[PDB]
Amino acid sequence: MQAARLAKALRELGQTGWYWGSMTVNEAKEKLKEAPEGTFLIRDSSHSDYLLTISVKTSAGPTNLRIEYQDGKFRLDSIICVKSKLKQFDSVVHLIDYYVQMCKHLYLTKPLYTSAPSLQHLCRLTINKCTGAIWGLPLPTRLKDYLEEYKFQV
Amino acid sequence: MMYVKLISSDGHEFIVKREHALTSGTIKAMNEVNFREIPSHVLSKVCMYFTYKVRYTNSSTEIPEFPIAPEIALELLMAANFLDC
Amino acid sequence: DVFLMIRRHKTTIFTDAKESSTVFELKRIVEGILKRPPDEQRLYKDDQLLDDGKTLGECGFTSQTARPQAPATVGLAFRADDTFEALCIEPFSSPPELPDVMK
């Protein structure tokens, strides 16, 4: 089941609009250079052991925090973050969503979009921020299904 | 053309740049268009998103947030699905 | 650049131009869409009318406060024969109340 979970996680990641793919460290640094503290994005990790990286603005500057994908699960780089204080996720967006919320520890706020997301998605984000119960919404079945595909608040 | 017309379900006339209205994949399929299902409070937002989308394609600048009020979210979703955008 | 919606009655126009463009130039852009002249059109920001010579920036439009996602409203009124009509804007539809599910 390792692949199935990875593929899905990548499908979600493409939906975010803040997955930058083969972006480099110096590209991430120039992009986030003057952005607001907490501004973040995800790109591929250059390192052999790591799959993805969170590139985020800090008062210090843009920095990077890597994501492990081992044994069907994601978590933050356990070298920098204390392994005893690490939750695990089946989704890399779930992971990022979880941390965005918690700090309303890791300071993520708004994602830096590669391009303007669709309005449909932008609504999906607003809707999800209000409610979890999709079944009880004055909407047709196809739109309810769209909301199921991406539950997150970012 | 240069511009086009969009008429809300409650009659409001919205006039937008030709290439801005092409954001909606449904609109690209066809100088005036009527929308019996989409009210003016929803269609006004859809015109704003067009401005947003076109402005922030291939952007050297940071793409800002497009605010949506909870009240319009449900209708704007249905409209945005309708319009393919 | 500055993004705005020019409104009269049930009509609303989405466009843009330099922050340094003149109110007349904007009136001239309305003539290209609505086919009336500049001298038979009176613009306005909220309640106060605008001067043809002043820049959109001088009028207070700024890029900062009139962006694509939130474009500023510009009032418009026509020359009713031997006078000008009262600047009027039809309000947009009212949204429903939120269902309980969306708090």
Author numbering:
A (entry chain A): 31 to 134, 149 to 198
B (entry chain C): 16 to 45, 58 to 112
C (entry chain B): 2 to 104
Can you quote the paper on this entry?
SOCS proteins such as SOCS2 are negative regulators of cytokine signalling of the Janus kinase/signal transducer and activator of transcription (JAK-STAT) pathway. The SOCS proteins each have a similar domain architecture. SOCS proteins also have a C-terminal SOCS box that comprises a BC box that recruits EloB and EloC (EloBC) and a Cul5 box that recruits Cullin 5 (Cul5). SOCS2 has been shown to bind GHR as a substrate for ubiquitination and thus drive its degradation by the proteasome.
During these investigations we found that, having been soaked with the small molecule solutions in DMSO, the diffraction patterns of the crystals could no longer be indexed with the same space group and unit cell parameters. These data for DMSO-treated SOCS2:EloC:EloB crystals were instead successfully indexed with the alternative space group P32 and approximate unit cell dimensions a = b = 186 Å, c = 67 Å. The change in unit cell dimensions and space group represents a six-fold increase in the size of the ASU, thus containing six SOCS2:EloC:EloB complexes instead of a single one. The 12 unique arsenic peaks were confirmed as sites of cacodylate modifications on cysteine residues. The six complexes in the asymmetric unit were refined against a native dataset processed to 2.9 Å resolution. When analysing each component of the DMSO-treated SOCS2:EloC:EloB structure in this alignment we find that EloB, EloC and the SOCS2 box of SOCS2 are well aligned (average RMSD of backbone atoms = 0.62 ± 0.25), whereas significant deviations are observed for the SH2 domain of SOCS2 (average RMSD of backbone atoms = 2.1 ± 0.9).
